[PDB]
Design an enzyme around this catalytic site. Structure first.
Site, short mmCIF file in Angstrom:
data_model
loop_
_atom_site.label_atom_id
_atom_site.label_comp_id
_atom_site.label_asym_id
_atom_site.label_seq_id
_atom_site.Cartn_x
_atom_site.Cartn_y
_atom_site.Cartn_z
CG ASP A 16 -1.68 -1.34 1.36
OD1 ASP A 16 -2.31 -1.79 0.38
OD2 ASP A 16 -1.62 -1.95 2.46
CD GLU A 17 4.70 -0.47 -0.20
OE1 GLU A 17 3.79 -0.82 -0.99
OE2 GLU A 17 5.53 -1.27 0.26
CE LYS A 19 2.95 -2.43 -4.67
NZ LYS A 19 2.64 -2.16 -3.23
CE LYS A 21 -0.24 10.58 -6.87
NZ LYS A 21 0.07 11.52 -5.76
CG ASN A 41 -2.75 -11.10 -2.82
OD1 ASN A 41 -2.57 -10.84 -4.01
ND2 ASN A 41 -1.79 -11.58 -2.05
CG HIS A 44 -2.28 -1.27 -6.70
ND1 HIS A 44 -1.13 -1.29 -7.46
CD2 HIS A 44 -2.11 -2.22 -5.75
CE1 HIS A 44 -0.30 -2.21 -6.99
NE2 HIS A 44 -0.87 -2.78 -5.94
CB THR A 244 1.94 -12.11 0.16
OG1 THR A 244 0.95 -12.63 -0.74
CG2 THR A 244 3.21 -11.78 -0.60
CB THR A 305 -7.98 -6.34 -1.30
OG1 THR A 305 -7.30 -6.19 -2.56
CG2 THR A 305 -8.45 -7.78 -1.14
CB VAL A 419 2.04 16.75 -2.27
CG1 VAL A 419 3.50 16.85 -1.88
CG2 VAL A 419 1.82 17.21 -3.71
O1 LIG Z 1 -1.46 -5.46 -1.41
C1 LIG Z 1 -1.61 -5.65 -0.21
N1 LIG Z 1 -1.60 -4.61 0.66
C2 LIG Z 1 -1.41 -4.87 1.96
N2 LIG Z 1 -1.24 -6.03 2.57
C3 LIG Z 1 -1.27 -7.04 1.68
C4 LIG Z 1 -1.45 -6.94 0.32
N3 LIG Z 1 -1.44 -8.19 -0.28
C5 LIG Z 1 -1.24 -9.01 0.73
N4 LIG Z 1 -1.12 -8.38 1.94
C6 LIG Z 1 -0.87 -8.98 3.25
O2 LIG Z 1 -0.16 -10.18 3.04
C7 LIG Z 1 -0.50 -11.13 4.08
C8 LIG Z 1 -0.86 -12.46 3.48
O3 LIG Z 1 -2.17 -12.37 2.86
P1 LIG Z 1 -2.47 -13.05 1.41
O4 LIG Z 1 -1.53 -12.42 0.39
O5 LIG Z 1 -3.93 -12.74 1.11
O6 LIG Z 1 -2.21 -14.54 1.59
C9 LIG Z 1 -1.61 -10.48 4.90
O7 LIG Z 1 -1.10 -9.95 6.12
C10 LIG Z 1 -2.15 -9.40 3.97
O8 LIG Z 1 -2.72 -8.32 4.68
#
Ligand SMILES: O=c1[nH]cnc2c1ncn2[C@@H]1O[C@H](COP(=O)(O)O)[C@@H](O)[C@H]1O
Ligand SMILES: O=c1[nH]cnc2c1ncn2[C@@H]1O[C@H](COP(=O)(O)O)[C@@H](O)[C@H]1O
Ligand SMILES: O=c1[nH]cnc2c1ncn2[C@@H]1O[C@H](COP(=O)(O)O)[C@@H](O)[C@H]1O
Ligand SMILES: [Mg+2]
EC number: 6.3.4.4
Lengths: 430, 431
Positions: A16-17, A19, A21, A41, A44, A244, A305, A419
Site C-alpha cells: 500500500d505504498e 505503487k 500511482k 489480494n 490499488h 504473502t 481489497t 503530495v
Molecule cells: O497489497 C496488499 N496490501 C497490503 N497487505 C497485503 C497486500 N497483499 C497481501 N497483503 C498482506 O499479506 C499477508 C498475506 O495475505 P495473502 O496475500 O492474502 O495470503 C496479509 O497480512 C495481507 O494483509
C-alpha cells in the site's frame, strides 16, 4: 545486445505504498505494463481525471488504451474475480480492455475452493491458536501451495482439452476436501462456469515467455513491471509467516515473467512517508495512539481489497534499508508526504534495540522483531498544506529536509514526491 | 562499483544431468564462496578429481575446496538427516572439516521426515488412481515448498530459537499432514529428538544469509560462484509442468534464493549436454527409442545412479535450448559430453518444431501440444574420432569444432567450455 531493459516499481514496506500511482504515471508512454506475482489480494487505486479505479489483477496501465497490459506466469488468477474487477471498472469508463490485455498461458488458476480453504484455514488458526495470518482470504496461499504440489491447474490447462481439465479439476477438488472435510465444492457448477470462462479468455492468452522475449529483443520498447505486495511481505524475505506467498522482491520479476537479470533496468522502491501494514505481524514503529489514528485517518488507510483498517506508524528505515539490500533500488518514490502536513514533529525509526543494544541487521525470526525497541530521530514538521505543490520549490523548508533525510539515510535518490492522490500530485525531482 | 562484486552462476539448460558438477568444480578452484540458491537434496552433481568421484545433493560441490566457504541460501529446503548422511559418505572418501566451511542461511526452510513420507504417499496414491505419477525423487521437496507457500513450514531460525515453541509448531504441522493422509505415520517424539540433535550440530554454521551475502559482495573483492540445481525444463514455472521440481532453478531463483538484486548477477553459464536426456514419462520431441538411443544411454552412462532406472535419450534439441536461453539469458555455455558422440558417423539435431503443419516459433507450455510437435532435424557429419585427450580447441577434429559452432550459432550464445570427460582435466576452454 541484451535488448530493452524493463522498468520496475516495487513496494519497499508492507504494501500500500502507492505503487499504482507511480506506475500509472510511468505508464503514460509505456508499450507494455505488466503484472509479476501475486493475485487480486493486491489492491490499488488509480486516480485519473478526478476519476478513481480499483485494480487488483489488472496491471494499472490498463487505463492506457495505447498500451498492452500483461499478466505474467508468476501470477495466480481467479477468473470470476478477474472479470468482476474488469466489469466493475467498465461501469466507470474502462472500455475495450479485453482487446489490450494479454495473459501468459503459464499463470496458475485460483479456484473458488482455494478461496474457501484460505478462509477455512484462517478460521482454524484463529480458533485453535487464537491468532491467524490476516490473509485477504482470496486463496492466494492455497493456490501457490497447489502450484508447489504441481496439482494446481494453469491457464493453458483450461484452454486445453476440457475433459482432461475437468478430470484434473475434480481430482484437485477432492484433495482439498480430504484435508478439509467441511469444505463444500459444487464441482459441476464451478466447472460449468470455468468452461464459460475458457472462451472469454482464449483470445487473450499467449505463450508468455515468447511474448516478452520478442518485446525485449525486437525494436526498442518501454516495458514497465508493476510489483505487488511488498518487500516485507515477501515469502522468503518478509516477516514470515506473516507475509504473502510470492516473491514481491526484484527476483520475482525474473521468475514471474521469464526474463533474465540483465533485462532489468530501473527499479523504483515505493516508500510511503509513514509506515503501515494490514494483517497480523510485528510492526516496530506502530503507533496505537492519537498519532496512529491521525495517520490512519488523514491517509485514508483502509485496505482496498478487504476494507480492514490498516495499522499505522512512523517511517522505519530498518525495513527500508533491508528492502534496498534485497531489491537494489535505483531510485525512490516518497508518497503521501501531505499526510504529515499537520504534525509539529515527525519521528522516523533509525535502528532497533534489543535489551538496550542495537542489532546489526533485520532479524529472520519475526518474534525477536516483537521485542525490539525502536530508536527514533525527531525531525521538525512543516505545519503547512503541501497538496498544491507541483515542483520542489513549492515545498516548505522542513518538508524538503524530510525528503532529503530519507534520501541521505537510504543512499538512494528520491525521484518522485507525492503530495496528493491525483496524477498531477506527483513531483518529479530529476 | 558501488553496486558491489558480481556472482557467477552455473545452470542446467535441459532436463538435468547435463554434467553440472564438473563445471561447478572447475570454476570453484579459485572461488571464495560457492553456493546453492534453490531446491533440495536431489542435485546429484558429480565431481571427479585425483581419481576420486564425489556426489553432492544438498552440499555445494565446492565443499571440496578447503579454501572456500560453501553456502546454502534461503531459497533452499533442507532435510537435516539427508544433509549429514551426504556429508559422511563423502567424509569416508577423504572430505574433512567440511562443517568448518559450511554456512547455512537462517531463512532456509526445513524438509521434515513426514514431508518425505508424504511425497512418496502422494506418488503411490496418484500412481494407482491416474495410472501414472509425477516421478519425483521422493525427497519431500514438493511438500516442503508446499508448506512454505502455506506459511506453515518451519525454518532454520525457528529450529535454533526456543525449542519448546519449535516443538509446538512442528506438532501442529505434523498433524496437519496427517489429515491429508490419515495413513501417514509420524513418530512426533522421535523426530523431534533427532531434530534437537541436528540443531545443536548445525548451530555454529547458521547465519543471516541476506547480510552474509551482502557483506561478501560489498567488502574486499571476492569471487562468488552460484551452483544451480536441477534444470530449466524442471523449473516450477518454466519447465514441462507438472513433470518439474518445485523451485525456480532458473536465473531468477538466484535473486530470490540469495536475496541479491540483478546488478549483482554477472556471468550466467548454461550447461548444455551434447545430446538430450529426460527422466520419467512426458513429451520428449527428439527421443530416440532405437539403437542410437541405446548407444547414447550406454556411452553416457545415463541411468539413475541409485534406482538404476535408465534415462531416456535423444538428439540435441535447440528448441529447448533457445527457450532456456530466453529465460536464463546465458552469457556463455558449457557444451558437455562431446566425447559420447566420438563414434557416430552422423549427428542429427532438432532445429525447430512443426505443429499441425506450420513451424511454431515458441516452446509449447502444454504437454499435449509438446507431445504433438513434429521435429525438423539438421544432419551433421560425425568426426568419428576419440576426443577424450583433447585439451585445446585445435585438438578437436573439423567435424567436432563444426558441431561446437552449430550450437553457438543456433543458440546465439558463445561456447566457453567443451567437455570430453568426467574428470576436471577433461575440459577445453575456448576463451
Ligand atoms: O497489497 C496488499 N496490501 C497490503 N497487505 C497485503 C497486500 N497483499 C497481501 N497483503 C498482506 O499479506 C499477508 C498475506 O495475505 P495473502 O496475500 O492474502 O495470503 C496479509 O497480512 C495481507 O494483509
Ligand atoms: O564431458 C563429460 N563427458 C562425459 N561424462 C561427463 C562429462 N561431464 C560430466 N560427465 C558425467 O555426467 C554425469 C552427470 O553430471 P552431473 O550433472 O554433475 O550429475 C556425471 O556422472 C559426470 O561425471
Ligand atoms: O534423475 C532425474 N533426472 C532428471 N530429472 C529427474 C530425475 N528424477 C526426477 N526428475 C524429474 O524431476 C521432477 C521433480 O522431482 P522432485 O525434485 O523430486 O520433486 C520429477 O517430477 C521428474 O520429472
Ligand atoms: Mg548427477
Amino acid at each position: 545486445a541484451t535488448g530493452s531493459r524493463v522498468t520496475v516499481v516495487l513496494g519497499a514496506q508492507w504494501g500500500d505504498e502507492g505503487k499504482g500511482k507511480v506506475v500509472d504515471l510511468l505508464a503514460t508512454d509505456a508499450d507494455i505494463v505488466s503484472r509479476c506475482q501475486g493475485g487480486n489480494n493486491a489492491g490499488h487505486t488509480v486516480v485519473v481525471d478526478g476519476k478513481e479505479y480499483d485494480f487488483h489483477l489488472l496491471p494499472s496501465g490498463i487505463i492506457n488504451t495505447k498500451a498492452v497490459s500483461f499478466i505474467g506466469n508468476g501470477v495466480v488468477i481467479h477468473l470470476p474475480g478477474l472479470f468482476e474487477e474488469a466489469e466493475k471498472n467498465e461501469k466507470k469508463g474502462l472500455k475495450d480492455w479485453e482487446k489490450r490485455l494479454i495473459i501468459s498461458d503459464r499463470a496458475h488458476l485460483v479456484f473458488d475452493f482455494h478461496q474457501a480453504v484460505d478462509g477455512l484455514q484462517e478460521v482454524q488458526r484463529q480458533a485453535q491458536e487464537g491468532k491467524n495470518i490476516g490473509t485477504t482470504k482470496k486463496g492466494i496461499g492455497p493456490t501457490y501451495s497447489s502450484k508447489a504440489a504441481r496439482t494446481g491447474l494453469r491457464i493453458c490447462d483450461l484452454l486445453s482439452d476440457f475433459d482432461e481439465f475437468s478430470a484434473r479439476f475434480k481430482n484437485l477438488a477432492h484433495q482439498h476436501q480430504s484435508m478439509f472435510p467441511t469444505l463444500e465444492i459444487d464441482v459441476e457448477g464451478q466447472l460449468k462456469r470455468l468452461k464459460g470462462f475458457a472462451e472469454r479468455i482464449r483470445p487473450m492468452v499467449r505463450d508468455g515467455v515468447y511474448f516478452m522475449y520478442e518485446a525485449l529483443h525486437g525494436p526498442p520498447k518501454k516495458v514497465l513491471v508493476e510489483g505487488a505486495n511488498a518487500a516485507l511481505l515477501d515469502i522468503d524475505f518478509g516477516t514470515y509467516p506473516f507475509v504473502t506467498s510470492s516473491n514481491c522482491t526484484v527476483g520475482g520479476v525474473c521468475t514471474g515473467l521469464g526474463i533474465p537479470p540483465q533485462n532489468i533496468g530501473d527499479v523504483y522502491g515505493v516508500v510511503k512517508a509513514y509506515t503501515t501494514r494490514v494483517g497480523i505481524g510485528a510492526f516496530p514503529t506502530e503507533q496505537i495512539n492519537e498519532i496512529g489514528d491521525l495517520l490512519q485517518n488523514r491517509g485514508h488507510e483502509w485496505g482496498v481489497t478487504t476494507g480492514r483498517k490498516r495499522r499505522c506508524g512512523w517511517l522505519d528505515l530498518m525495513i527500508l534499508r533491508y528492502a534496498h539490500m534485497v531489491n537494489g533500488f535505483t531510485a525512490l518514490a516518497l508518497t503521501k508526504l501531505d499526510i504529515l502536513d499537520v504534525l509539529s514533529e515527525i519521528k522516523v525509526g533509525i535502528s532497533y534495540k534489543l535489551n538496550g543494544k542495537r542489532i546489526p541487521y533485520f532479524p529472520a525470526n519475526q518474534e525477536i522483531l516483537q521485542k525490539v525497541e525502536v530508536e527514533y530521530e525527531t525531525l521538525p514538521g512543516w505545519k503547512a498544506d503541501t497538496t498544491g505543490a507541483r515542483k520542489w520549490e513549492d515545498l516548505p523548508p522542513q518538508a524538503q529536509s524530510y525528503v532529503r533525510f530519507v534520501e541521505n539515510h537510504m543512499g538512494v535518490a528520491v525521484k518522485w514526491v507525492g503530495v496528493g492522490k491525483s496524477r498531477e500530485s506527483m513531483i518529479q525531482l530529476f
